[PDB]
């Protein structure tokens, strides 16, 4: 295990904190929240979306072929 | 405070402190406003101490 007081070394760093009864738990939830969600999705969409679009195209083609491959031809 | 009669101290006050500003001060009094107390925390981390 590991304990507080034996983790690492830190110097010259100040932390200011406020009590949770002095502040609001939902401050600017929609005012600042939505623009941050847009930035987060914008920053990662190009890395996540393409492979799942690639899956979507294979999925529709493969079923479209199979769904009609067992249709009959005049010959 | 010490070995001294209050008469003497008042005589000296009326002598050497009469030149002070009167009771009125031209409407500019310091009125201490209440001071908000805030539950909060400040940590200055310094492991070299």
Interatomic CA distance for residues A59 and A51, integer angstroms = 12
**Which residue of A11, A14, A17 is in closest CB contact with B48?**
A11
* Residue B45 β-bridge partners: A13
Give the tokens for residue B44. 């200055």
Interatomic CA distance for residues A35 and A41, integer angstroms = 10
| Superfamily the domain A1-75 falls into | Cytochrome b-c1 complex subunit 8 (1.20.5.210)
Q: Write B27-33 long-range contacts (CB < 8 A, 24+).
A: none
Place of tokens 């996540």: A48
Non-local CB neighbours of B44 within 8 Å, separated by 6+ positions: A13, A14
Give the tokens for residue A4. 């507080």
Interatomic CA distance for residues B20 and A31, integer angstroms = 58
Q: Would you say A19 and B40 are in contact if contact means Cβ atoms under 8 Å apart?
A: yes
Residues of chain A in contact with residue B38, where contact means CB-CB under 8 angstroms, are 18-19, 22
Which strand (E) or helix (H) includes residue B43? strand B40-46
Interatomic CA distance for residues A57 and B17, integer angstroms = 97
Please indicate if any CB of chain A lies within 8 Å of the CB of B43.
Answer: yes
Interatomic CA distance for residues A7 and A68, integer angstroms = 64
Give the tokens for residue B2. 């010490």
Give the rounded distance of the alpha carbon of B18 from its chain centre.
20
Strand, helix or coil for residue A32? coil
Give the tokens for residue A27. 């401050």
User: What are the structural domain ranges in chain A?
Assistant: 1-75
Non-local CB neighbours of A18 within 8 Å, separated by 6+ positions: B38, B39, B40, B41
CA distances from B46 to A4, A5, A7, A45 (A): 15, 12, 14, 42
Interatomic CA distance for residues A63 and A71, integer angstroms = 13
Interatomic CA distance for residues A39 and A32, integer angstroms = 11
């Amino acid at each position: 295990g590991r304990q507080f007081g034996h983790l690492t070394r830190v110097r010259h760093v100040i932390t200011y904190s406020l009590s949770p009864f002095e502040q609001r738990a939902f401050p600017h939830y929609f005012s600042k929240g939505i623009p941050n969600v847009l930035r987060r999705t914008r920053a990662c969409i190009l890395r996540v979306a393409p492979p799942f679009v690639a899956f979507y195209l294979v999925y529709t083609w493969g079923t479209q072929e199979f769904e009609k491959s067992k249709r009959k031809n005049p010959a | 405070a010490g070995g001294l009669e209050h008469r003497q101290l008042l005589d000296l006050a009326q002598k050497h402190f009469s030149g002070l500003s009167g009771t009125y001060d031209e409407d500019a009094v310091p009125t201490l406003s209440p001071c908000r107390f805030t539950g909060s925390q400040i940590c200055h981390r310094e492991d070299g101490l």
